[PDB]
């Protein structure tokens, strides 16, 4: 009788997608579409909080999972049996695309792989049967919530950094838009925040769909080759290409951390976003501390701006240093920042988007125009260095971005 | 009915063990296969004792 609704609901909503994604990354097929869709429909489902038993919509989604998983498992089993009884062509293309794979007796993770995905699907189906038949019976908190919103903001930045391309270009655009809205210190409505979250979740689901369904061997073999114009532009990388007896790009750099980390990083990003959607010295001491902070915020941001000029080389960087010395040469340093904060923000954001364009997954598509030989910022051919340098760039541009926040706040105080 | 079901299940497994005695003493030679299929049936021999 002591049926834990929350515990078993969390077990479902977390582990069954987990083993689901494991059996998926094992082998890609139409099982990708169906099975990843079964995972992603749940998203942030209405919790079973001891009310109205299992939700009607949740129950409908779960019974759809029953039907689809049972049909897929039975079909794969029947097709494998038929192949065994009977036995690179179009029939073989459909053979890979459906979910079947050739059986060979020489694999620890390969001979089992011939039937493991359907075994895992049947096990998940049985667990769902058991669970559905069994379930039918703040100040520090607010500070931590804002801190986790900030680290989700940083995670949006990081997942934009890991694959600079049109797959994450919209991520970076949403990042900059919400950052500028939050910088004006105008309280952004919870409706707009919910709309931004919904757009992020929808485009993330589309991103999973395209990245994985493109990871199917047939798609990259037939429709368009791996690392072609669209993969170089939008961003499409195939991770696993090893198959049964009839693996990405090249291994000149052994690490290749961003390329291998893209799936798991974006997956944990999805999980964090859906979870967030569901979720003495007296006053004189820190008042003087905050007074010093507001009197030296432009100074510290400008020193970080120099640090950017040290790390990165450009005639733009020359413009950065000349604007730095202009701002730090006069008596009205605070007033100078107060007046030219929008201009420096526009310049730095343009520099961000320009180095992003220069760090796109595209290579040799634009060539080496006059803005390269004369100016000279690296193309970032290796992504391992690119991810680190652009993460340094954003963590450095954070305070020079906050200076406009403080300037606007002060500005509407008078 | 549940207790009689437990009775029937215990007698089911007693019959299965008695019938598997001969399956393991003279019918074990079907279990001397190669890897793969033989490996799987070797495991099921282990897990059916």
């Amino acid at each position: 009788m002591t049926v834990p609704p929350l515990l078993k609901s969390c077990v479902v909503k977390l582990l069954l997608p987990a083993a689901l994604l494991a059996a998926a990354i094992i082998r890609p097929s139409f099982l990708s579409i169906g099975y990843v869709l079964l995972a992603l429909v749940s998203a942030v489902l209405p919790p079973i909080r001891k009310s109205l038993a299992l939700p009607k919509l949740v129950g409908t989604f779960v019974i759809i999972t029953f039907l689809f998983c049972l049909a897929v498992a039975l079909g794969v089993g029947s097709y494998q049996i038929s192949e065994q009884v009977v036995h690179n062509r179009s029939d073989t293309t459909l053979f890979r695309s459906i979910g079947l794979v050739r059986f060979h007796p020489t694999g620890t993770f390969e001979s089992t792989r011939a039937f493991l995905p359907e075994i895992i699907a049947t096990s998940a189906a049985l667990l769902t049967i058991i669970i559905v038949m069994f379930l039918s019976h703040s100040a520090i908190g607010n500070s931590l919530r804002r801190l986790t919103n900030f680290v989700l903001f940083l995670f949006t930045a990081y997942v934009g950094i890991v694959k600079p391309s049109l797959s994450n270009s919209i991520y970076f655009l949403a990042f900059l838009f919400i950052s500028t809205w939050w910088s004006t210190y105008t309280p952004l409505r919870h409706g707009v925040y919910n709309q931004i979250k919904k757009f992020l979740i929808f485009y993330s689901a589309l991103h999973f769909l395209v990245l994985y369904t493109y990871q199917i061997p047939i798609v990259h073999h037939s429709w368009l080759p791996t690392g072609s114009f669209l993969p170089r532009l939008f961003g499409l990388t195939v991770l696993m290409d090893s198959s049964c007896p009839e693996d990405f790009n090249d291994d000149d750099l052994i690490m290749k951390w961003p390329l291998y980390a893209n799936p798991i990083v974006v997956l944990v990003f999805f999980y964090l976003t859906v979870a967030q959607y569901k979720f003495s010295a007296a006053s004189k001491g820190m008042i003087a501390v905050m007074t010093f902070v507001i009197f030296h915020s432009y100074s510290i941001a400008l020193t970080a701006m120099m640090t950017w000029a040290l790390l990165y080389h450009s005639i733009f960087g020359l413009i950065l240093l000349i604007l730095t010395c202009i701002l730090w040469i006069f008596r009205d340093t605070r007033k100078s920042s107060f007046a030219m904060a929008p201009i420096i923000l526009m310049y730095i954001e343009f520099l961000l988007i320009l180095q992003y364009f220069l760090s796109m997954d595209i290579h040799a598509e634009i060539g080496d125009p006059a803005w390269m030989n004369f100016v000279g910022i690296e193309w970032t051919t290796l992504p391992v260095h690119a991810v680190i340098i652009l993460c340094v760039q954003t963590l450095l541009t954070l305070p020079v971005f906050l200076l406009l926040r403080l300037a606007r706040r002060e500005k509407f105080y008078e | 009915k549940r207790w009689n079901a437990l009775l029937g299940y215990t007698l089911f497994t007693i019959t299965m063990k008695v019938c598997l005695q001969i399956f393991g003493c003279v019918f074990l030679s079907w279990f001397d296969q190669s890897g793969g299929w033989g490996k799987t049936l070797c495991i099921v021999r282990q897990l059916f004792s």
Binding site: - | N4, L7, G8, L11, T15, Q21, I22, C25, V26, S29
Partner: protein
């Protein structure tokens, strides 16, 4: 035989116990004859020496042993005979009990309803403390399912 015995009510067992005891009392001499087998002086082979020629001699010997078919010069264990004899003893004595019997042994639920019966011949042993036999009765009819 055990499976057909257990999952059936006492009426069916009463009907088939004569058949079962006849079967056991026929098998026991048959089993002893099978253990004895043909004399080696006869020099006549057994049919089960060629039932499965595709296997080794050990497999054929074990197959004949589990079927309790005779093997030339094999030491049949006495435990088989002792166990079968004890089964025969119990079967014969239970047949004797079955012939001299009314309605005491079978279930009291033959009427059909499973609610508490109005009257029962024996007192409420749980509350009373007649003797140590009452203690044992309470222990085994109140916590026997635990065991």
């Amino acid at each position: 035989w055990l499976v057909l015995f257990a999952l059936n009510k006492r009426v069916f067992v009463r009907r088939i116990w004569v058949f079962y005891v006849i079967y056991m009392a026929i098998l026991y001499p048959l089993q002893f004859f099978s253990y004895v087998g043909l004399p080696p002086d006869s020099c006549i082979e057994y049919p089960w020496s060629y039932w499965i020629p595709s296997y080794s001699d050990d497999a054929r010997f074990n197959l004949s042993y589990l079927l309790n078919l005779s093997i030339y010069g094999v030491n049949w264990p006495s435990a088989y005979l002792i166990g079968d004899f004890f089964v025969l003893l119990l079967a014969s004595c239970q047949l004797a009990v079955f012939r001299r019997e009314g309605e005491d042994n079978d279930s009291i639920y033959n009427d059909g309803n499973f609610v508490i019966k109005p009257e029962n011949p024996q007192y409420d042993f749980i509350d009373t403390k007649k003797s140590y036999v009452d203690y044992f009765k309470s222990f085994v009819f109140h916590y026997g399912h635990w065991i």
